């Protein structure tokens, strides 16, 4: 089997994307937000406080054929980014672009944070790191993809998402009329969950290329691209105005600036990031002060590839016995 589905972005800046997942019988369709970055599966609810919900498509279980509370299972996640959720868990059929898996782990949220409430675009998340990150107890429950795998005819999956653009999830094949060129394969590490992995250096616009091992995640949940602070120093040195603001929280620039590519290594091949995609835009409504999208990993405790790297790519998440990553340009 296979799967195929569109995923759009949230706003103008490509904040995050959103993918249709359609949920119980008869279907009930929410637009989820795909995090290669985290492995729990979970929706807006009938479950969820009620003054935590602004605007969100629920999921209401009572109204499902299918569903099936699994008796005593309680999650709690904690995000990056400070935000978090929690509840109880069903299990029921989930469908994503054709592509079914029965019996899949739907984590019901009782409680979510504000940053959750306060997007109306988005109706939870659909997890696509390694299972051993999910956060179901007693018992660890397995990912969409996790229990799609043996069915696909490949156990891959890919992401393209665009800029400023629609893009793609595909299920178990690989589409060739993706990407240009060819798909240069890495090795991925699970041993902290993640689509771990090490470029081989970057370059700077025009500059030659720095060959230096960086470790990092692929991580379709994250923004921005999250770099040590020796390469992100020397990516915004050459940025007219450029600075790191405390206030702000990050490197900031005049909005007017021209911004360099960044290029980074995936073996002996290299994905060039366009200036453009680097420019968050203003700091606030109205400034001349717009937000970079390479920023400093120091304090994460990881380096992290997101939307802004992911998307100048067509990204192979394969999921056979050993994994590996691979990264064409398009």
Same mark, same amino acid.
Do not use: A, E
């Given at each position: 089997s296979t799967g195929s589905a569109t995923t759009t972005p949230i706003d103008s800046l490509d904040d995050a994307y959103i993918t249709p997942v359609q949920i119980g019988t008869p279907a009930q369709t929410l637009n989820l937000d795909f995090d290669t970055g985290s492995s729990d599966l979970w929706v807006f609810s009938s479950e969820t406080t009620a003054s935590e919900v602004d605007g969100q498509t629920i999921y209401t279980? +009572?109204? +499902?054929?299918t569903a099936k509370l699994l008796s005593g299972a309680t999650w709690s996640i904690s995000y990056g980014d400070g935000s978090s959720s929690s509840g109880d868990v069903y299990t029921d059929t989930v469908s994503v672009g054709g592509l079914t898996v029965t019996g899949q782990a739907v984590e019901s949220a009782k409680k979510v944070s504000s940053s959750f409430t306060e997007d109306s675009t988005i109706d939870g998340l659909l997890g696509l790191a390694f299972s051993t990150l999910n956060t179901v107890s007693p018992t660890q429950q397995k990912t969409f993809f996790d229990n799609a795998k043996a069915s696909l005819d490949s156990p891959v999956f890919t992401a393209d998402l665009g800029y400023h653009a629609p893009g793609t999830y595909n299920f178990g094949f690989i589409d060739t009329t993706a990407y240009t060129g060819s798909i240069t394969y890495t090795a991925v590490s699970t041993k902290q969950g993640f689509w771990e992995w090490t470029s081989t250096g970057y370059a700077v616009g025009s500059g030659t290329f720095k060959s230096t091992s960086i470790d990092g995640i692929a991580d379709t949940g994250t923004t921005l691209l999250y770099l040590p602070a020796t390469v992100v120093s020397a990516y915004w040195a050459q940025v007219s105005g450029a600075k790191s603001s405390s206030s702000v929280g990050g490197y900031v620039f005049p909005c007017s600036a021209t911004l360099p590519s960044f290029t980074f290594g995936v073996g002996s091949a290299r994905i060039v990031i366009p200036g453009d995609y680097i420019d968050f835009g203003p700091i606030s409504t109205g400034s001349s002060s717009c937000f970079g999208g390479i920023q400093s990993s120091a304090g994460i405790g990881i380096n992290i590839f997101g939307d802004v790297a992911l998307k100048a790519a067509f990204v192979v998440f394969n999921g056979a016995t050993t994994p590996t990553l691979g990264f064409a340009s398009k």
């Open positions: 279980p +009572s109204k +499902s054929t």
